[model samples]
Target chain A: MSYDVVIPAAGQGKRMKAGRNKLFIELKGDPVIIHTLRVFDSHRQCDKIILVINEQEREHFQQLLSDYPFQTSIELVAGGDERQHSVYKGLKAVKQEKIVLVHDGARPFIKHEQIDELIAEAEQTGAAILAVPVKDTIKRVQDLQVSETIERSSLWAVQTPQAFRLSLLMKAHAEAERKGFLGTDDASLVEQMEGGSVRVVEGSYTNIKLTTPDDLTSAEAIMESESGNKHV
Target chain B: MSYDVVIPAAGQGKRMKAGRNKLFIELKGDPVIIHTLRVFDSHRQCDKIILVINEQEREHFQQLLSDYPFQTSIELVAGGDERQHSVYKGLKAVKQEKIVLVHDGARPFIKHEQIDELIAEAEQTGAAILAVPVKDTIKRVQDLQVSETIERSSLWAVQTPQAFRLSLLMKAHAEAERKGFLGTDDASLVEQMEGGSVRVVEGSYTNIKLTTPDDLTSAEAIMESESGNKHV
Candidate 1:
């Protein structure tokens, strides 16, 4: 089955405040974007990668590509102002897909086996994604005092790359685009509209997003430890 | 200020049954035990390290130590079958009234700042150790079912180099030894006997014990990453 992976790389990484594109920052020895790309690049099932990047950095990214091992082929599309628009641009670059994996470029620790599981879930049930059961006690803190502890057993921290049938994803995206809707993640858009069951496949706790500078430190620790392989 | 560290390296690592000592396992091109040692070695406040080892591994440990940086001298004492016994042996190696930091050798990520915090807290409150508030909703589980949802805010997962007034620690150890009582962690022994407050200084989440094989992989990743510096 033919498949392509899309990565949204346009966000300015305002929280990181690294004076540079956060995606290009190294976790250990490799850049975060490269880590995400390497996962799909190494996958035998992934035919091509369609990366939606910021308009100005597209040329810079091309120059950076020479350092990475996955030179087979990549479709670098220019991103829009919003993350939704960038993802739409990536979807447009895909001519056809037996399956499509929409992933976050900053979350580099997404494992190879997890990606395969996402694809397998898509093949069986039409859509799925990587997620971790919430281990923390969630409290609604108003005025700095906790109201009550929310039940955490049913809660999960959703992660990516969310996988789906290309046609189903395309329909979801078109509907969202037409309605002028923005989503926190891709699964929310699809799951809300089509009444599709977006099942959670247990993901590694180490599959973290580099949303802030502090998170980069944690990501670096995860990368150096090769925490995905550790299972602890 | 002169300080002595008591390292409990006597654990059989029952959970990590790799046919050899797991603490000797390589992380970022160095042994895990050595990683812990270097933390204390570089501390300006520390005068010496009293390493309590399993009797079988002493010679090999000394041979390995020959290659490490000797900013401060180390004395390897024989370890007992139990952790309490091992700690007591190391305690005997140092003279009274100076600070003694009881550290777990497997936990390599204890930071210098956290150590300083422990020292400060010990000076103020009679004893102190590193700890982080439990982020996860702890439950009293019996046979895989939740018996009770524990209050997360009150709970903390304790970590080490528990710093104490050497005299107070000696009295606590003597009482524990006389009573033939064993405790989960060093502070527990002192708490039951002395009834003095044991303060919790915030520790980095990365100061995790290498109990299982997965921990070793995570430790390896942590050791290899630039983020490892944050722990120090």
Candidate 2:
């Protein structure tokens, strides 16, 4: 049941307008990345942690790790120009071709049970990821006009902690590199591989990626609710 | 420049497991429906408010309305079994075949500017709805396996306050009724009509529909942040 994890933390998250890597931003007295890392660091099912970061932020991550004192076996790897490339680099850092999970470093609130569910499902099906049913009615727009309303029943809002057989992910990334094809997520690379299937595990709504300033508000609220603070 | 609104408060919101209408649930200090109604009530451009509710809840709605003093003209209409049917009933209650908006009664945080934008767009283009860009990487899954990663760049998570010319909406609904087609939202019926184009107005991330228990947490947090209380 043990799996290695790839934490991609290279992106500057320009949408946040923080003028720095958003992962370094504090949420409840700790940097977002540390909180995310702690989730895996404390999970007994997690065997290793491969942190992929921008080469320039090596000193920053190192300093942060030193300050936090994470007990997990985290191996720092240089990231690439894009998230896909960064994840691919982290994938290479895995010592064995076992189960590997690719999770966003900004998402710090993913429940351990959700990760366990994803791991179990991926173990059975070769590929699996955390996701939630699309709550809103989705529409297809063209020329600023809605062309169609997509059926919301089957539609899902996909999230990270995407688990896969390390060898399968490696093959997917290798093929993608050969074809010069860039995918939005690691699961996409596998999905593009003919006959590949990725299972979806339902995750908590609280498991949100910190992308904007408003998300921080939600994050704080999520933490508050977690600690039994029900005040409005 | 002015429009009427159909606020659907009919659904029991079975997912919320409240044993009552979820719209009756309190978020801050008042009931959820009142918060939603006030948004339209206070808007200068809003001409009328037509509230569609379950026939059984007529007295309850009346009592709640009496408790809160509203500025706009409020009309209560009996709702149908399905949301589509309820919306149709509300549409019929519109005094004039002018611009009409369909908004969920549980969604309270939708800003005035977004409603105005949707109204303006619908006036110019026949139909329009509020929406936000899909933040997560969306995947198409079949049999618990991902078939494809949908292009997220163009995809959007549609919100409510869907506006349309009353005549056009009536026509669309009539055609849908004749064909016995049920749509997820009002815009879907319009989308199904040939040459019917619905424009999209980018709305706030805070405009969330209260569907489940956890949404209350985010709602409280959103309210807190808006009120200048930024804390962990």
Candidate 3:
């Protein structure tokens, strides 16, 4: 039941207002990426770790692996621009397992058990995404005017640690790059393949991704949470 | 130059688990309903405050009015069952200016100016609803499977108080009652009328509805916000 996990750390942490990559920004004594990296290392079932980062930060990531005491086999891949491109690059680095999980490095709060559960789930289906209920009533709008108040009984707020059969995602990523159609999300790309359907696994409310300064504020609070991620 | 506001204080809110109506529960030294009632009093253009309550709570409300020194003319209307039904009963009590507002008794922190802008708005449409951005990524799910990842750029999280023209909403509610259709929300009833299109006025995040114990936690944080409501 081994799986390779991809951690995308390609974006410059502009919204976070941090000068360095947000993943490299220290949270709770370790770098944010290390928080995720340590989680995967804790799960013996997780196979290889592929971390996709800015081409400029490849050296930095390599140094991170050397500096941190993570025992998991982690590899660094160069990524540019779109996170989809970064994910595609990390997917190419997969060699050990049929299962591949694409998770956000910024989300240091996702527990290893959730990753294990999400990984096992894709074995039951081609793809599975971690989700939580959308917390607010939603309405679809056109020009600041509402067309419909969408029913909330079945609405899900999508988060990451989206697990896939490596071949399924490889084909999805391949066709997407071929057609030059960027997806709204990684799972949506699989949906566009027409025959594919993604399954949902209820995820934790606290598995939040840090993108803004406000997120870092919550990140501090969440880290102070249950003494708390995957290999990157 | 003035408007009437309908505050639906009907339900013996089962969720809040208070012995009586949750509106009677105090937050920051005043009843939650008082926090909301005080907001409308700040606006000089606001006229009558229509308080919709259960038949049993009518005596309690009259006592509440007597105990609190509210300057605005507040009326009590007996309501039963659905909040929409409560609203229908309260709407019947309106005999003031053409502009009408329907707000939640649970949301205590909405600034008067948002209601002012919303009141000024439906003069621009037939209806205007207070809204805030949906804070999370949304997906349409069917039995735990996703059909679409709804676009977020145009998605709004609807809130209250929704402003409407007296004639427009009266007709909309009457027709909905006649047709035996319950709406997702008060605004949805207006939307169902085909010709009735609702406009959006961005509202405050702090204007949250209190349903769970967790909101009581943040309710404390919000009142610690700016020193802050309407006459009722």
lDDT (tens digit, per residue) of candidate 1 on B1-232:
4579999876525533322677787887888888889998888998989988877777788888997778888999997868888898888899667888998888888888888878887887677767655543333333222233344445555677789888888888888889987765667666666364566666776677776665675565555564444521
DockQ of every candidate structure: 0.06, 0.57, 0.35
Q: What's model 3's overall lDDT?
A: 0.79
lDDT of 2 by residue, B24-85 (tens): 88888888888899899899999999999888878888888999999899999988768888
Chain A TM per candidate, in order of listing: 0.88, 0.93, 0.89
Give the better candidate number (2 or 3) by lDDT: 2
CAPRI-style grade of the A/B interface in model 3: acceptable
**Highest lDDT: which candidate?**
2
Ranking by TM-score: 2, 3, 1
Complex DockQ, candidate 3: 0.35
Residues B20-89, candidate 3: write the lDDT tens digits: 6677777877888888898887668878899888777677677777888888988888886688888989
Q: Estimate each model's TM-score.
A: 0.55, 0.95, 0.81
lDDT of 1 by residue, A1-232 (tens): 4478988885525533222678887767777788878887887888989988776776778877866757547988988757778887898888865899888888777777888878888887777777665443233333322233344455555677888888787888888878886665666667557565565577776777775555676666656566345433
Model 1 lDDT, residue B172, Cα: 84
- Model 2, runs deviating above 4 Å: A15-19, A229-232, B15-19, B229-232
Q: Please write out the lDDT profile of model 3 over residues A8-50, one tens digit for every residue.
A: 8854244332236777767767888888888888888877788
Rank candidates by DockQ, best first.
Answer: 2, 3, 1
Instruction: Give the count of colliding residue pairs in each prediction.
Output: 3, 1, 12
